[PDB]
Design an enzyme around this catalytic site. Sequence first.
Site, short mmCIF file in Angstrom:
data_model
loop_
_atom_site.label_atom_id
_atom_site.label_comp_id
_atom_site.label_asym_id
_atom_site.label_seq_id
_atom_site.Cartn_x
_atom_site.Cartn_y
_atom_site.Cartn_z
N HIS A 61 65.72 69.12 29.54
CA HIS A 61 64.35 68.57 29.40
C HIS A 61 64.34 67.25 28.63
CE1 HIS A 61 63.03 72.45 30.89
NE2 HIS A 61 63.61 73.06 29.87
N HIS A 91 64.20 64.20 19.27
CA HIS A 91 64.39 63.92 20.68
C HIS A 91 63.37 62.87 21.08
CE1 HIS A 91 61.19 66.93 20.41
NE2 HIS A 91 60.69 66.26 21.43
N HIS A 93 60.85 61.34 24.60
CA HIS A 93 60.28 61.43 25.94
C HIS A 93 60.21 60.00 26.44
CE1 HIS A 93 58.83 65.56 25.03
NE2 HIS A 93 58.84 65.06 23.81
N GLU A 103 54.00 60.22 25.24
CA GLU A 103 53.14 61.39 25.40
C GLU A 103 51.77 61.09 24.80
OE1 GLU A 103 55.64 64.89 24.16
OE2 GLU A 103 55.62 65.05 26.33
N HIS A 116 60.22 62.01 18.69
CA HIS A 116 59.69 63.14 17.94
C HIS A 116 60.74 63.65 16.97
CE1 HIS A 116 56.68 64.04 21.39
NE2 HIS A 116 56.27 63.07 20.59
N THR A 195 54.52 69.98 22.83
CA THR A 195 54.14 69.33 24.09
C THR A 195 54.93 69.84 25.29
OG1 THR A 195 55.70 67.51 23.90
CG2 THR A 195 53.49 67.20 22.84
C1 LIG Z 1 61.02 76.95 22.15
C2 LIG Z 1 61.28 75.68 21.44
N1 LIG Z 1 62.19 75.42 20.57
C3 LIG Z 1 61.92 74.11 20.21
C4 LIG Z 1 60.84 73.65 20.87
C5 LIG Z 1 60.08 72.40 20.86
C6 LIG Z 1 60.15 71.55 19.77
C7 LIG Z 1 59.42 70.37 19.73
C8 LIG Z 1 58.60 70.05 20.80
S1 LIG Z 1 57.63 68.57 20.73
N2 LIG Z 1 57.85 67.75 22.09
O1 LIG Z 1 56.25 68.99 20.66
O2 LIG Z 1 58.15 67.78 19.64
C9 LIG Z 1 58.50 70.89 21.90
C10 LIG Z 1 59.24 72.07 21.92
O3 LIG Z 1 60.53 74.59 21.83
ZN LIG Z 2 58.75 66.03 21.98
#
Ligand SMILES: Cc1ncc(-c2ccc(S(N)(=O)=O)cc2)o1
Ligand SMILES: [Zn+2]
Length: 257
Positions: A61, A91, A93, A103, A116, A195
């Site tokens: 992802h 990470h 996007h 985002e 993020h 997200t």
């Molecule tokens: C199940 C799971 N473990 C980690 C995460 C996750 C962490 C940050 C984000 S975001 N994009 O909101 O930073 C989205 C998902 O999902």
């Molecule tokens: Zn993120």
Amino acid sequence: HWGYGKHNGPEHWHKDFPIAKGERQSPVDIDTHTAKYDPSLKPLSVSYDQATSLRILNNGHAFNVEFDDSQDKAVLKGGPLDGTYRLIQFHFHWGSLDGQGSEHTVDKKKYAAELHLVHWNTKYGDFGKAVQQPDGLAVLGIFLKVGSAKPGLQKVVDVLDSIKTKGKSADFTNFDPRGLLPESLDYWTYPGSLTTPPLLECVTWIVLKEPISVSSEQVLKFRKLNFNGEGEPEELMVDNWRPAQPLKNRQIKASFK
Ligand SMILES: Cc1ncc(-c2ccc(S(N)(=O)=O)cc2)o1
Ligand SMILES: [Zn+2]
Ligand SMILES: Cc1ncc(-c2ccc(S(N)(=O)=O)cc2)o1
């Protein structure tokens, strides 16, 4: 099976993750004129001097740079936050083109990418428990625009060929995430969600007003990653962003006038 394709993208997520249509979903558009200055908001405290990066992972992802979060080594405090939040991973996007990829948006403007930095509230003991709480996570969001190179990003860019496909990881020690920050820590903040699935409503979002600049070559290298596993048909890892969701009953607060 969720993803960012025509058949498994953001429009489909609600079927397995009904909270996708919830009351505090992320990301959102930040309407700069409607965001209210909150003079009671504290400066953010970013304390990354003792950060221990460990590994970089293509999870199908995005790619995560993971940190040792078994001690208070890289923490976020202050701002809208109560208590101490430990850095677990960062990470990005990003888009297939420079005109999209972020985002969050700012007055409907899309940036080329969004970083993020994910932190969890130490009062809940670990990340899995934290995501079950309304104040479990603090994600620091930083926009990327295309212009001059970001020197502190290059070590990340250069390892990507070794984690091209889903499930690949590489050692990634001694990376200093302070090199990814802009000069100013002025921010907007609002209560929101992860997200990506599971879209849990556990995040205090802190989005920096000042974007960082990265070069076209740097972002082009993000776009060479693959969503697929090794020995599968190549599907470029691009446009791994969720669009803006309804603000509903929420106020975005600004740390700055
Ligand atoms: C199940 C799971 N473990 C980690 C995460 C996750 C962490 C940050 C984000 S975001 N994009 O909101 O930073 C989205 C998902 O999902
Ligand atoms: Zn993120
Ligand atoms: C072609 C195909 N096989 C399975 C799926 C699929 C499974 C879960 C999701 S969801 N609701 O998790 O986004 C979206 C699509 O699509």
